[PDB]
Design an enzyme around this catalytic site. Sequence first.
Site, mmCIF file in Angstrom:
data_model
loop_
_atom_site.group_PDB
_atom_site.id
_atom_site.type_symbol
_atom_site.label_atom_id
_atom_site.label_comp_id
_atom_site.label_asym_id
_atom_site.label_seq_id
_atom_site.Cartn_x
_atom_site.Cartn_y
_atom_site.Cartn_z
ATOM 1 C CG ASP A 11 94.874 17.728 55.844
ATOM 2 O OD1 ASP A 11 94.640 16.883 56.044
ATOM 3 O OD2 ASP A 11 95.496 18.579 56.083
ATOM 4 C CG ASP A 17 97.658 14.855 60.808
ATOM 5 O OD1 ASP A 17 98.696 14.174 60.170
ATOM 6 O OD2 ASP A 17 97.259 15.914 60.955
ATOM 7 C CG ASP A 73 93.940 19.532 61.167
ATOM 8 O OD1 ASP A 73 94.253 18.585 62.030
ATOM 9 O OD2 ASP A 73 94.015 19.718 59.894
ATOM 10 C CG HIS A 85 96.822 16.264 65.493
ATOM 11 N ND1 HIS A 85 95.477 15.665 65.273
ATOM 12 C CD2 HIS A 85 96.779 16.780 64.237
ATOM 13 C CE1 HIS A 85 95.158 15.829 64.251
ATOM 14 N NE2 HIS A 85 95.874 16.524 63.384
ATOM 15 C CG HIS A 111 92.920 15.160 59.014
ATOM 16 N ND1 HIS A 111 92.727 14.500 60.191
ATOM 17 C CD2 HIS A 111 93.848 16.217 59.208
ATOM 18 C CE1 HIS A 111 93.521 14.987 61.107
ATOM 19 N NE2 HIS A 111 94.259 15.915 60.592
HETATM 20 N N1 LIG Z 1 97.977 17.055 58.306
HETATM 21 C C1 LIG Z 1 98.391 18.114 58.976
HETATM 22 C C2 LIG Z 1 99.308 18.156 59.893
HETATM 23 O O1 LIG Z 1 100.978 18.032 59.550
HETATM 24 C C3 LIG Z 1 99.389 19.468 60.664
HETATM 25 O O2 LIG Z 1 100.056 19.644 61.959
HETATM 26 C C4 LIG Z 1 97.577 19.466 60.699
HETATM 27 O O3 LIG Z 1 97.247 18.720 61.879
HETATM 28 C C5 LIG Z 1 97.231 18.976 59.380
HETATM 29 O O4 LIG Z 1 96.166 18.417 59.464
HETATM 30 ZN ZN LIG Z 2 95.988 17.174 61.466
#
Ligand SMILES: N[C@@H]1[C@@H](O)[C@H](O)[C@H](O)[C@@H]1O
Ligand SMILES: [Zn+2]
Length: 1015
Positions: free
Chosen positions: A311, A174, A62, A441, A60
């Site tokens: 992540d 997510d 971000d 997100h 994952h």
């Molecule tokens: N899993 C995590 C989420 O809670 C955060 O806001 C970020 O998106 C991070 O990937």
């Molecule tokens: Zn995320």
Amino acid sequence: CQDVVQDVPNVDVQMLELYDRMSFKDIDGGVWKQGWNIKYDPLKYNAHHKLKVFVVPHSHNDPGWIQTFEEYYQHDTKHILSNALRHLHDNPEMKFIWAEISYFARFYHDLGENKKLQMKSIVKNGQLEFVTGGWVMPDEANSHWRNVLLQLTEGQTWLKQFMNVTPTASWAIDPFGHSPTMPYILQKSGFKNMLIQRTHYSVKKELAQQRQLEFLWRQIWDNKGDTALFTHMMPFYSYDIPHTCGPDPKVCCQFDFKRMGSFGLSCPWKVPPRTISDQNVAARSDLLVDQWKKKAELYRTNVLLIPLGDDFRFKQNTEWDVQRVNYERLFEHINSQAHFNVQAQFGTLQEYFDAVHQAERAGQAEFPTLSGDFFTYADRSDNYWSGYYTSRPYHKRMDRVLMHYVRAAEMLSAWHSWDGMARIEERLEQARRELSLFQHHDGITGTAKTHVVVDYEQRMQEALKACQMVMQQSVYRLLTKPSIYSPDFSFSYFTLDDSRWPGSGVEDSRTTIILGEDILPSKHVVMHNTLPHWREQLVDFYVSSPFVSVTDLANNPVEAQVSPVWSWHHDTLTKTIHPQGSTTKYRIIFKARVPPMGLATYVLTISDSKPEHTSYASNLLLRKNPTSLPLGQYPEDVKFGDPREISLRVGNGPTLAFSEQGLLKSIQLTQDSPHVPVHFKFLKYGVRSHGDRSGAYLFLPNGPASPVELGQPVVLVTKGKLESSVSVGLPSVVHQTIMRGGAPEIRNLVDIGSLDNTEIVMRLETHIDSGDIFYTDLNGLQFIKRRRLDKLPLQANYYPIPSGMFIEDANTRLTLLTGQPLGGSSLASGELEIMQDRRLASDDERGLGQGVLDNKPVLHIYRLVLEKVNNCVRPSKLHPAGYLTSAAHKASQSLLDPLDKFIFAENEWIGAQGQFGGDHPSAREDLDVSVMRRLTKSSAKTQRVGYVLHRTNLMQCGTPEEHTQKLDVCHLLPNVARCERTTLTFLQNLEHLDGMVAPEVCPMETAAYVSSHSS
Ligand SMILES: N[C@@H]1[C@@H](O)[C@H](O)[C@H](O)[C@@H]1O
Ligand SMILES: [Zn+2]
Ligand SMILES: *[C@@H]1O[C@H](CO)[C@@H](O)[C@H](O)[C@H]1NC(C)=O
């Protein structure tokens, strides 16, 4: 067309009904803390019925969160992708899925040709599979559907061009709760399957008990089911390895082989992973297969999905090796031991779905139907993620501004083919990509670190400048005599004038039109109307004299109103908030009439005295102890008075009454009708002093809101023939009610200042007998019925308000439309409330590692529509949807897609024309051309233009439909050679259209068309 009002769909799971029935008890379920101790019949599987297990490696990534996009790319993502390429190349049975095309495109373009070819090969051969293929994995609460489509199109267009693939399975592990807008767009973009994860723990339990975690997700109004998209909901608390192998994270964590120590990771459940060996593989396999078989109990087929990731995983080569080699040993053992009756392998997401549907076709399973949404999410206890519906509201508002700019720039420039030297495609690509990135997100949601929010803002500012450049070049080309047109593609022929962004009192960035006998007698201005119907709308400009009159380009006078330019100041000497008037600039306001998808030119001319067709507003400042307010040449002296109730009416529209504090108290629709109580109030929520603290994600109020102490605020009343307003300087909010003859406009300049641990809410109090029902929109696309549930805490009854909300009874409706996504609710019958800003000192334990202390002044905009609805044909009481009236929909369009205003930069515009688009069809009010985009560069012999058409559904209330013209988008540009219906991303042709005519769409439908032109 399907009737979206009168036929209540019959679905197995309807989420509003489910919510009404569920108890939401948060009991300790054992090792599966939010479930139960799963039991399975070991005899369920045998040689003839094996469990097929797909272990799907993922990472994952971000696009900004705790670091910026570029920081993560340099530190993590470029290594993950480089090592994925190497490891997948070298290990043909290994698999990996990838979601975020923003990162993948950044990486691919930096590869040498040899590596690009290797990458194409591992994609073509199915080892690396793209899931969803959007630029990002977007938020689903605050995002507008137009921008969800934009980002999906950006990523998939890139994938088609460079990778020759178009994903048909979506992966959304997510976003903080899930919207049915996603399957709506995905199903109209070729998708066949989708996966979601962040749904309330009580919902996962309930659906797991019924094996309803896989379902055909249809829209709430869809009686027939053609919108349905197969959806897989993951069952457990997280997508990390401890929560994806099965119900017991103490066991599953032992199969995350990155957690043995050298990587700086461990298992919180205190049992570490152990390297798989010939001496332990039987025991390890028996533990793992037992978890798998428990997870499989929750689903209907013998095909099991096991995600393997977390992540920014799969970075180091040593990590690739440790996961791969250990799982390979497990697979070899398990698959060779008949007693397990398991076949396990690395797989991709598409492989999982293909196998599930093979099982379905074999008669092994039938899937339930479902409608509704999955807000508001809670991951545990009372921790509802409704705070991010409001967090960082400046940037939420900016999103909507840029949304419109991108649409307008793409549309204005689509009319022509442009020389490469014009850099039109370059600027549009930049603007689309920056807006797309912000859909992430942690972007629009306001859940990123301060410096990351700054990065998103800077990117969006560059995108706004790019849109302005393209728009103004386009206007100059569209409105200059062709044989005169001589463009300098770097020059600013016009500047955009935007009255509501960043806004009065946010940034002093609007240019004054400077006129004078010894400098410049007159100025051309141009309005653009991106909507496909004729529009009249008041527009305003700043001018350097009050003695200005307006004409159209046939030199016909246009009625205008001049008002002062008022700015509010927190006077740190007197400790009051009060307005100051300019003595050098003035606002001129007039009605612009603009063709569908067109342009109209007007001229502003100075004179030495009051012009015949320009009137002047009166101004009344209500406060004790007033002092003078000079206004330069403005011809009407400001009047003063003690605070008092006042009433205003513009044109033949509603009469609004205001308290002595400058806040609405009643609306009277017509001369005879009642003064309907509609009271605005500002309140504040605080933060708990024990237990969990609110933060960027979580809203954990310390009880119901308390009224803001208003003192004796200063109220300014401006009364004009065309526009009137009441403005008041409240603590933290300059609140303005503006009247132009129809539904009022509300503007709040919100500056929460240094009020720590405070959330400011705007509430409307009415007599409407709404009970526990209210309606909120999903992504600006549809309105969903909500029911306030007193069995849930206050924060659970908060929902996203991405574009509007309403309450109603048998006779009366109040609708509040928004120009920015914010959180809101109806916490008591007759009330609506919407959060304005929140300033939080504490982190909320979700990894962000800061509070929200970077607030800045933001101008929120709204329209308020009070209506009689007793004559409207409404859905039955059991229908889960609601629908706007014509006036409310138009009010929403006024906020999201206003007229664009351009001021000619030079002294004289040679070859200027008066109008463009006067021959464009003026389509029915419920139809929009959501996107117009030229798809080809100038060197293409066959030009192609893409259109996305959206038809909303408006209530029938007995206002006869007027005669309107059919809109055929395929004939908007000349020399059409072909018209095709396409997926919404324009990437697949679905239908070759007879007569090259694009049919209009049905209510609640969206279609895409591409016209081809031979020129
Ligand atoms: N899993 C995590 C989420 O809670 C955060 O806001 C970020 O998106 C991070 O990937
Ligand atoms: Zn995320
Ligand atoms: C793109 O994919 C299709 C698969 O149907 C293939 O026929 C086509 O040749 C591919 N294009 C390439 C490899 O350039």
